[PDB]
Ligand binder design. Sequence first.
Ligand SMILES: [Ca+2]
Lengths: 87, 26, 457, 146
Amino acid sequence: AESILEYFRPYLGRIEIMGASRRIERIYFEISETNRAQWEMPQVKESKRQFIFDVVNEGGEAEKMELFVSFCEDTIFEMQIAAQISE
Amino acid sequence: RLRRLTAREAATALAALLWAVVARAG
Amino acid sequence: GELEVQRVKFLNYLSRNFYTLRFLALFLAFAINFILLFYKVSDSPPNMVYYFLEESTGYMEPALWCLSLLHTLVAFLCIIGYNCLKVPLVIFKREKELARKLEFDGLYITEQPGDDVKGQWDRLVLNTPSFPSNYWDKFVKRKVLDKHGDIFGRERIAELLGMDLASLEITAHNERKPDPPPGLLTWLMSIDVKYQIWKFGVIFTDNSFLYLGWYMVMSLLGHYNNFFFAAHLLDIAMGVKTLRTILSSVTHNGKQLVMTVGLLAVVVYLYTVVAFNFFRKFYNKSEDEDEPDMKCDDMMTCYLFHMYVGVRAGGGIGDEIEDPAGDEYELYRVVFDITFFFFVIVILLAIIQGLIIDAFGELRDQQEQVKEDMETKCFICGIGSDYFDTTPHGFETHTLEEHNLANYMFFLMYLINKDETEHTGQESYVWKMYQERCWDFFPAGDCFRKQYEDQLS
Amino acid sequence: MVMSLLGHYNNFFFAAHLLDIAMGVKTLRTILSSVTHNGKQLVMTVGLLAVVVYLYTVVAFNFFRKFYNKSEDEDEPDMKCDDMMTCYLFHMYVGVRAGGGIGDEIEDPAGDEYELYRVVFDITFFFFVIVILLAIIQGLIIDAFG
Ligand SMILES: [Ca+2]
């Protein structure tokens, strides 16, 4: 089953979590058919370059990761309105 | 042309600037 | 109302390519300013007249006036594109922080509102019925009531945060719900005009919006017979990243030199009065056969003289003064002159030059620290690349199958399109934990292998 | 080779043979390669120099035209602030090479009219080209050895 994996690698997303078990595991899931392709956009890829800049020059407690989720919530809203503009 | 600045007017403006700068960290 | 769809569809074209439209200003600014370098003033109309000299070519006709409006029009559409593409999010940024504030904090309720710049203005939206008009959550008023309405005067909380008759209408919207027809272009004035003022206040406080708008006013003002079109070059040519560091350097240390240059103005003052009291008879600029122009006559005239010549002399005050070879006070001036040389030119100017150059001593370093973290840290879990270089490509593969800080946004996006029933035994685990906004689920120190070190490589 | 062949003309082309080989010394190569190493940096910076003077070029040509006055004997047909390009050429042929600011080859600003305006123009020129910008350009080249 080599051909199954290659055609699904652009549709397999991985993650590592740490909680409720005092140990780390892996969780898999299919992503999408359109979101993965649309995420590669010059509109957003410049923003993350600014984003990765801010997280590193100022560093403290877990609030560093807090704003990281905040960016993710903000990022999809940019992506949400993006689909409403393109014909 | 523009307004003609006499010595006293510029002196007062610049001295007010200097005193404001000092008083903001005085 | 038929053209309304086309009008909106027309705006879609503008917002499709905004940065490209902005780029035309750069090239157009050169030509309108490059050819401006052929002016020739004359005392004769083609009072004085700012005559314009042209070349043999047929252009630089009054089409420059058409070129002038051409520069403004391409900027004019940028207003609409910015207003239609860059500011549905500016509202969202302020919307989210206040809603997230109200979930955890009761500053507007418990203690006092914040010495309240950009926060005092926020009290307006509390009574506006259309607060969640942009944010994802549209039920924030009910969560805040649950946690703080009972512990306080429930009517007071139900009054301050809006809820028009909702104290008894909270349970009213539970039996059924009809669907009224849309009344667009008929009852449009029946909107929260008070909230509209709140939106505009945020717009006029935006850093980016003013700068682009500030670009407009000169373009309109440039249509006067003047050279205002040159100013368009400066405020946009700064858009280059490496150029921005140079100009921002003086801004970065602005709080430091402002107190230092002041010391320069007082040291010269000491040297100003001492010469005006004793060395008055030596300045003597000596115009032909008479000397009515003595810089050491008025208290302010002598002061203006030194910082118009002395600090720009480059070599000390003893370069535009008369000869100190006279018998009287011969040894005193060299004390005055040499001490001047050390205590302004050699030292103070070097210090001022030192701070500005030292600004690059920090700004350049910040452009390198953003590269070393990428080579060592993954920014996700508290591990460097040292353990990942034990195996070949171990840090390289760590960015593809381990946490790549990119699949996470996809992972969250999958959650919205999945019902609460279909969540797995762990997908629902993070979803509840996400809502209470803790962030302990991130690895932070271990990625699938440190806990699995001795068990199996 | 080509200069050696071309050097047979009655000319001094033989001097160029010295430069391109005397660089063969290792410690000398570092010096000459220093400007090459940071070439991508100063090229965008020196451009900012050419535009800042342009701002000061137009402002004087519009207001301070009647002060330059190089004043050849008994007549003044040679005013640097007459043509749009002539004034521009004047500043970067004298002002940046003056070493002390533009107020070293200009006439006396002691006149009653606009007396306090020139010192604003003159002093601001001193800070924003000679003190800072030239130091920055010198800074990058010396930092190449760093
Ligand atoms: Ca289930």
